[PDB]
């Protein structure tokens, strides 16, 4: 794999979103990976519905949090609508997939990156955007305004984001806190520290959708 990967430059990343007060990072995270892989396979960059996952993933807890892997499993089993058809409301409501006609896209499955393995994550990011988790509760992460972020942070992972690239010393992360946060909504997190947890626990739990 190359020394630099940046899916934004391959047109596989949609504009940065703001999840708002709702604890929907898990759905925003999953949608990035769906947006990326559908671009990769079909050549079309579309936006898909975080709100659909928020409302319809019964294994997750809506705005109280959830699981990127189950959201990704939901898209593999059923599918997902365009963000336009099913826009973000920032609150969990009932699942309205049926009232919005045919799914716009469907994946074929979900895989886990082997955890606590930096090479395995980079290998996956070289193929497509990956859903990853990290500890975002610390003030240093929250007040991040740019640069390669080294912490401080623990591994009490609490926030699902999406890795859409990497470099020699960092993994490039799309956050869902709007374009005002970080680097136009992104964060470069240090890699290659030998911490098998990853900085801020970045290697704890990573998933990506499969699209044949
Ligand atoms: C993240 C967010 O929206 O800031 C959520 O709070 C969330 O889904 N958390 C989730 C754990 C991560 C997937 C690691 C949970 N169940 O706490």
Curated annotation (Swiss-Prot):
Repressed by the active-site-directed cysteine protease inhibitor E64 (L-trans-epoxysuccinyl-leucylamide-(4-guanido)-butane) produced by Aspergillus japonicus. Inhibited by the inhibitor of cysteine proteases from Trypanosoma brucei (TbICP, rhodesain) and Colocasia esculenta cv. Kaohsiung no. 1 (CeCPI, tarocystatin). Repressed by leupeptin, a peptidic cysteine, serine and threonine protease inhibitor. It is an enzyme of class 3 (hydrolase). Optimum temperature is 50 degrees Celsius. Unstable upon 65 degrees Celsius. Belongs to the peptidase C1 family. Disulfide bonds join 22-63, 56-95, 153-200. It catalyses: Hydrolysis of proteins with broad specificity for peptide bonds, but preference for an amino acid bearing a large hydrophobic side chain at the P2 position. Does not accept Val in P1'. Changing residue 36 to S: Enhanced thermostability and higher optimum temperature. The chain holds residues 134 to 345 of 345 of the full protein. Its EC number is 3.4.22.2. The keyword Cell membrane does not apply. The active site is at 25, 159, 175. Optimum pH is 4. GO terms for molecular function: cysteine-type peptidase activity; serpin family protein binding. Keywords: Allergen, Disulfide bond, Hydrolase, Protease, Signal, Thiol protease, Zymogen. Cysteine proteinase with a high level of diversity in substrate specificity, an amino acid bearing a large hydrophobic side chain at the P2 position is preferred. GO terms for biological process: proteolysis. This is Papain. It comes from the Eukaryota. E64 binds at residue 25. Leupeptin binds at residue 25.
């Amino acid at each position: 794999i190359p020394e630099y990967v940046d899916w934004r430059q391959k047109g596989a990343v949609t504009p940065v979103k703001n999840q708002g007060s709702c604890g929907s990072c898990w759905a925003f995270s999953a949608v990035v990976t769906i947006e990326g892989i559908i671009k990769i396979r079909t050549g079309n960059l579309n936006e898909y519905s975080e709100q659909e996952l928020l409302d319809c993933d019964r294994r997750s807890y809506g705005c109280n949090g959830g699981y990127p892997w189950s959201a990704l499993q939901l898209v593999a089993q059923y599918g997902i609508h365009y963000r336009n058809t099913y826009p973000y409301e920032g609150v969990q409501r009932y699942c309205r997939s049926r009232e919005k006609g045919p799914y716009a896209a469907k994946t074929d499955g979900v895989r886990q990156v082997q955890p606590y393995n930096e090479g395995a994550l980079l290998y996956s990011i070289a193929n497509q955007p990956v859903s990853v988790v990290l500890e975002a509760a610390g003030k240093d992460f929250q007040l991040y305004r740019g640069g390669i972020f080294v912490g401080p942070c623990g591994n009490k992972v609490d926030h699902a984001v999406a890795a859409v690239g990497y470099g020699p010393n960092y993994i490039l992360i799309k956050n869902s806190w709007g374009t005002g946060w970080g680097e136009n909504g992104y964060i470069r997190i240090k890699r290659g520290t030998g911490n098998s947890y990853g900085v801020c626990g970045l290697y704890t739990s990573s998933f990506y959708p499969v699209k044949n």
